[PDB]
């Protein structure tokens, strides 16, 4: 009996932490729409419906969303997919030209400048010999004054060429399910109260993740997965201030956003089979794009996050908010893509509050850039086509991305400012539950059996 032999057991359930590639999966309802008016349901496998969310019991795994993988892979996949949906579309190289711009026909005061500038310019037709004179509308944030007369040019025309987006492919998010390949499994921490780091006492394995719709937002991340009961803040280190603070709250705050300026698109032929989509007439009043939120629900959710943030900073602590301290445009405001057009909306109305230890609606004005340079590359800019009609959208605000100021010198107050920063902090708000492990079979173990000859 004490003459112990060894035995190999193949298919032993045991895993290790690993970092491998992943597996795209899209729902078949987005596959029902023909010719991919959203990106890549052909570059992504159809999701098998209701897959195996088999529970695991008496199992303690340590999760770490901050040093997590697959959020880097999601960032790389979305970047490469955004690049791969532009190579069919038309380059706007001949549009870099001297623009004769004036103000739009409007009873403008001298104080408030016109946001829209009308611009007429030469443009090549389909025929190489004949050029035409054509006009359009642009925003202040897309033209600069090259240098009596007043003549402009586009902003990107001395750093990079621009690619006009195809009006077929829309940027609205379809949900992406991530799946592990063979020999790997995705452990989902199903704990209710879980601050992103440490042992999760109630995990469950899975083959495919939930629907992760890729939204693009800097502050006030949109349509994410809200928490179960409480309002959970997450940080890599709360005492550190260089790391952001991902706030995920329970009740989603309804936001309404609209451009009320009615637009008419206009097809200008750059060349043979080259269509450019300019802005024609402003049918109706010239108004300003804006976003609304409910005053009472926003005050209530700020009370909830104050009640939760006082846990990490003591009870008798004053907590106040401020707006963004500065920088580039798309980190001061909060930016998003509503209906296939980009909004950059001011957030000073949402963060002027202080909090002591004891039917209206907030409107906030936006600005609309027609060109974008997201992810801040060296040589790419996307032109966006103007869309018809008055444009509105309703969304569920899910979480914030906050940042503590570097408070020293014995202050009771600790202020918070919304900071966008990297885009990965969006996906880290939706990949905190999951991790990827590699199954290793063929464990070995001593027992009392000897192989006979």
């Amino acid at each position: 009996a004490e003459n112990l032999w060894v035995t190999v057991y193949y298919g032993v359930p045991v895993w290790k932490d690993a970092e491998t590639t992943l597996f795209c999966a899209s729902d078949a309802k987005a596959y029902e729409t023909e010719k991919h008016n959203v990106w890549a349901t052909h570059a992504c496998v159809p999701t098998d419906p209701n897959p195996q969310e088999i529970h695991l019991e008496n199992v303690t795994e340590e999760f770490n969303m901050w040093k997590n993988n697959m959020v880097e892979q999601m960032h790389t996949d979305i970047i490469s997919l955004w690049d791969q949906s532009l190579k069919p579309c038309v380059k706007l190289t001949p549009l870099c030209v001297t623009l004769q711009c004036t103000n739009v026909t409007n009873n403008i005061t001298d104080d408030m400048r016109g946001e829209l500038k009308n611009c007429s310019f030469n443009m090549t037709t389909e025929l190489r010999d004949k050029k035409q004179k054509v006009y359009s509308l642009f925003y202040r944030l897309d033209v600069v004054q090259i240098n009596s007369n007043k003549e402009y040019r586009l902003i990107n025309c001395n750093t990079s060429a621009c690619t006009q987006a195809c009006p077929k492919v829309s940027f609205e998010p379809i949900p992406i399910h991530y799946c592990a390949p063979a020999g790997f499994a995705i452990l989902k921490c199903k704990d209710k109260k879980f601050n992103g780091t440490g042992p999760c006492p109630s995990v469950s394995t899975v083959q495919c993740t939930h629907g992760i719709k890729p939204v693009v937002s800097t502050q006030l991340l949109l349509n994410g997965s809200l928490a179960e009961e409480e309002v959970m803040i997450r940080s890599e280190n709360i005492t550190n201030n260089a790391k952001n603070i991902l706030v995920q709250f329970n009740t989603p705050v309804q936001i309404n956003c609209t451009r009320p300026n009615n637009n008419t698109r206009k097809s200008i032929r750059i060349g043979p089979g080259q269509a450019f989509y300019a802005t024609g007439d402003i049918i109706g009043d010239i108004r300003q794009a804006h976003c609304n939120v409910s005053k009472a629900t926003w005050n209530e959710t700020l009370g909830k996050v104050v009640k939760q943030l006082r846990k990490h900073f003591g009870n008798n602590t004053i907590i106040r908010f401020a707006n963004s301290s500065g920088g580039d445009l798309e980190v001061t405001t909060h930016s998003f893509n509503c209906g296939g057009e980009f909004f950059y909306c001011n957030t000073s109305g949402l963060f002027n509050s202080t909090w002591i230890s004891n039917n209206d609606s907030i409107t906030l004005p936006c600005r609309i850039k027609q060109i974008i340079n997201m992810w801040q590359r060296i040589g790419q800019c996307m032109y966006a086509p103007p869309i018809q009609g008055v444009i509105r959208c309703v969304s569920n605000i899910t979480g914030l991305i906050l940042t503590r100021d570097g408070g020293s010198t014995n202050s009771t107050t600790e202020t918070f400012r919304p900071g966008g920063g990297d885009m990965r902090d969006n996906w880290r708000s939706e990949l905190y539950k999951y991790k990827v492990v590699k199954i290793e079979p063929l464990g070995v173990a001593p027992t009392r059996c000897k192989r006979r000859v």
Binding site: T7, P13, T21, I54
Partner: protein, 132 residues
């Protein structure tokens, strides 16, 4: 739980239970190891990495005593310095994760012992079938 009494459920379900209970459910963790214009390269390298890992495991088994027996007694003994615990305690007391944490050091010498034992059994069987 639901699988109490008739102790089975889906794969990695026994991973929380003790290794004695988990030993009766090994066919599915063996099963869910193979089956499951530039993204095709990612899909293909995932699939061939899966079959390469599976073929490496089947070749590591095949050079030992068991091709596909999935439970193999063999002829190498056990150094009691490695386990240094009560034998029947570990099948009612330990998970496979904790056991793999225990014998993390004592690895890769066992495999060479298995290869030596299998080659010795092969030359003994060759001699036995030769003199007959």
């Amino acid at each position: 739980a639901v699988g109490i009494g008739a102790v089975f459920l889906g794969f990695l379900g026994a991973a929380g239970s003790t290794m004695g209970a988990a030993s009766m459910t090994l066919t599915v963790q063996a099963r869910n190891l193979l089956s499951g214009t530039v993204w095709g390269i990612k899909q293909l390298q995932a699939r061939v990495l899966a079959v390469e890992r599976y073929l490496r495991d089947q070749q590591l088994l095949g050079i030992w005593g068991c091709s596909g027996k999935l439970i193999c007694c063999t002829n190498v003994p056990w150094n009691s310095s490695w386990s240094n615990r009560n034998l029947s305690e570990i099948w009612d007391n330990m998970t496979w994760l904790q056991w793999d944490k225990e014998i993390s050091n004592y690895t890769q010498i066992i495999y060479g012992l298995l290869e030596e034992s299998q080659n010795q059994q092969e030359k003994n069987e060759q001699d036995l079938l030769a003199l007959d």
